[PDB]
Write a protein that binds this ligand. Structure first.
Ligand SMILES: CCOC(=O)Cc1nc(-c2ccc(C(=O)NCCC(F)(F)F)cc2)cs1
Ligand SMILES: CCOC(=O)Cc1nc(-c2ccc(C(=O)NCCC(F)(F)F)cc2)cs1
Lengths: 187, 187
């Protein structure tokens, strides 16, 4: 209600400046409520960022669940694309959420929990490919999955933030798919 | 002289706690000098971290230069190992240096400059392998190099910091070598 207005305001202002340059007053005004009324919905502007991150992460996670319930290069591209499209459609929340991992235990634990879930799912699919005889038994599945997932995190987020260096955003999906498919099917 | 004593003290204390919990007084005492005498060597404790990072980065860079001046899987392992051994022998400087990228323009620009140099060198070697007919013309060399270099940054540093998730430090070199060799030589 007013909660959604606070979240939308925060996402809107995060496109213009860091969380340190947004005050509870900024969020309050944007949602058409007083400052004390803000504190009824959220204990802090940091709790607003945590909720936004939690929604984007859960949106990615549900999209990956949807794929899982329904050629091999395209299978991997469709999974990587969940993360490219989801985080890529919420760049300001991605950037601020990643920056808050340094200062918020709750942001670090949220990120850590979902990365563990996505790595376990990556490993399970590599194992299924190995059991069906399509992928060779090279590295331990979970170790290969961990490095591929951490590559995606750093490479996607560097591209979205226009970092130097970074893969251009128009080339990053193809770049990651090549490295996943060659490292999973290669010996 | 006293400069080396300040640097050693800072590296020693960074193993115990973050830069925010080290004062110019801590560094001063460790080097056997007063606080005003500290300010003769360094403008700030942040300048001390920048100098430590600059030495570790230059040590990696010179070790890679040494390899470059002198089987293909082992060639790649020896290059990746420069970064594993160099940053892995200076874990506290690695952790604090990476954290300071968020708050120091000079740390961000140092990191960015050397990453660009290592990516350009990675691309040049992939191109040489393609020109000699050993590697296939798949992705653009510089884009493949960028993603592999960013994978190494995130995966090495997560392993060194014992992050959850992370590849165990005893498995990370083999993990990265597999992903480099399969993605560079694979189609
Ligand atoms: C039978 C269906 O199989 C598939 O759909 C293919 C599959 N893809 C994944 C997958 C998991 C994580 C990431 C990723 O990018 N992690 C990093 C996330 C982050 F946000 F950090 F970038 C990319 C892909 C698992 S299985
Ligand atoms: C003829 C000689 O060829 C060789 O020696 C093999 C070669 N290896 C590299 C190489 C460059 C960067 C990194 C790396 O890990 N970057 C990331 C650095 C960071 F610190 F971020 F981890 C790893 C390997 C270039 S060419």
């Amino acid at each position: 209600d007013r909660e959604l207005a606070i979240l939308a305001t925060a996402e809107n202002l995060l496109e213009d400046r860091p969380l340190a340059d947004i005050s509870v007053d900024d969020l309050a005004k944007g949602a058409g409520i007083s400052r004390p009324t803000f504190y009824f919905y959220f204990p802090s502007k940091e709790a607003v960022l945590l909720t936004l991150l939690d929604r984007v992460v859960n949106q990615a996670d549900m999209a990956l669940q949807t794929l899982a319930e329904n050629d091999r290069e395209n299978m991997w591209r469709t999974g990587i694309n969940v993360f490219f499209e989801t985080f890529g459609s919420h760049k300001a929340v991605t950037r601020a959420g990643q920056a808050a991992r340094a200062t918020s235990v709750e942001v670090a634990e949220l990120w850590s929990t979902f990365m563990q879930k996505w790595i376990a799912y990556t490993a399970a699919v590599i194992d299924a490919e190995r059991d069906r005889g399509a992928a060779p038994r090279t590295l331990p599945a979970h170790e290969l999955a961990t490095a591929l997932n951490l590559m995606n995190e750093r490479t996607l987020f560097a591209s979205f933030a226009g970092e130097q260096p970074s893969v251009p955003e128009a080339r990053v999906l193809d770049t990651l798919v090549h490295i996943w498919v060659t490292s999973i099917y290669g010996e």
